[PDB]
Design a protein around this ligand. Sequence first.
Ligand SMILES: CCCC[C@@H](CN[C@@H](CCCC)C(=O)N[C@@H](CCC(N)=O)C(=O)N[C@@H](CCCNC(N)=[NH2+])C(N)=O)NC(=O)[C@@H](NC(=O)[C@@H](NC(C)=O)[C@@H](C)O)[C@@H](C)CC
Lengths: 99, 99
Amino acid sequence: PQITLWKRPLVTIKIGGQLKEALLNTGADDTVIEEMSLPGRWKPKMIGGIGGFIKVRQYDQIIIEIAGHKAIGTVLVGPTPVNIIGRNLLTQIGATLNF
Amino acid sequence: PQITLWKRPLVTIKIGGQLKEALLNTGADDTVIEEMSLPGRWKPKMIGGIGGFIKVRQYDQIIIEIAGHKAIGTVLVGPTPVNIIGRNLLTQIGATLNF
Ligand SMILES: CCCC[C@@H](CN[C@@H](CCCC)C(=O)N[C@@H](CCC(N)=O)C(=O)N[C@@H](CCCNC(N)=[NH2+])C(N)=O)NC(=O)[C@@H](NC(=O)[C@@H](NC(C)=O)[C@@H](C)O)[C@@H](C)CC
């Protein structure tokens, strides 16, 4: 699709068997989802931006379906205000910014 | 241009006759720049990010060039970690997300 930017670019995702809404965020290095269970081992991480830092769990090799496009990568889980799809998964679905 | 997302989507901007680097950010409603001087009156604004909320100064109708494209619009100034070009100005330069 071509997504204009008049409104927040929200899409439906499927992760861990759950449907969620998430923000396509070219300003995020990483993908960050609100609290949920995921399989495998994890390690703690601190991630920052406006307002400072939050602590998250880092899970590797997680499959995600983003607006119908499957991708695999690292997913961070923690107390984010909004579910965020970052560049690590945007690249995998072929997303580009065009102007 | 077409900007891929394997690296951060950093571009050169010009504001107040000075060149700066900024992040093209689909996950930002607004454009937020690190401390600098801008002309005119400002109004207060609270904005939120991953870590919480910060206060910024809102300046209206500021001339800004983004990657060679001229925009005139609202610029927020405050303690952002990184200069970000948000959707208010991405729409002025005709940017879209495509996959
Ligand atoms: C400043 C740092 C770079 C840009 C920023 C954009 N993220 C978005 C989404 C964050 C969740 C809230 C953002 O802050 N957007 C703000 C920008 C400010 C603005 N006014 O536009 C926004 O739209 N805020 C809205 C509200 C958003 C939430 N709304 C809601 N919950 N209903 C607002 N009007 O205040 N990216 C990040 O915060 C990411 N940080 C990073 O990618 C890097 N960190 C640094 C410090 O560069 C990396 C080294 O970790 C996070 C997510 C970790 C991967």
